Structure 1
Amino acid sequence: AGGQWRLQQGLAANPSGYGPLTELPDWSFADGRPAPPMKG
C-alpha cells in the first residue's frame, strides 16, 4: 500500500526498495567499532 503516493514523492513504491532505511547500516558496535557492510 502507498506505492502510488511514494512514487508521486519520488521515493520507492515499496519502502523496502531504494532508501536510507534499507541502504544505511542497521547497527553499530557499542564499543564504537563500525559495523561490517551488509552483504545485501
Structure 2
Amino acid sequence: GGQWRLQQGLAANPSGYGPLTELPDWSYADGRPAPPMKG
C-alpha cells in the first residue's frame, strides 16, 4: 500500500518517520523513560 500511503502523506514504507518507528520501544516499569535508541 505504498501508493496509498504516499497519497495520505504517510511515506511509502510504514517504517519511515511514523509514530510506529519513531516512538520509544519500551520504558521502565515505574515510568522512567528509556535511553534513546541508536537508530
Question: TM-score normalised by the shorter chain: which range applies?
Answer: 0.7 to 0.9
- Alpha-carbon displacement from aligned partner over 1:1-34 (angstroms, at most 9, x marks no partner): x000000000010001111110110111102111
What SS does the aligned partner of 2:34 have? coil
Aligned CA RMSD, in angstroms, stands at 0.7
Residues in 1 aligned to 2:24 and 2:11: alpha-carbon distance in whole angstroms: 18
Q: Structure 1 length normalisation: TM-score?
A: 0.86
Gaps of 5+ in 1: none
SS at match of 1:28: strand
Unaligned runs of 5+ in 2: none
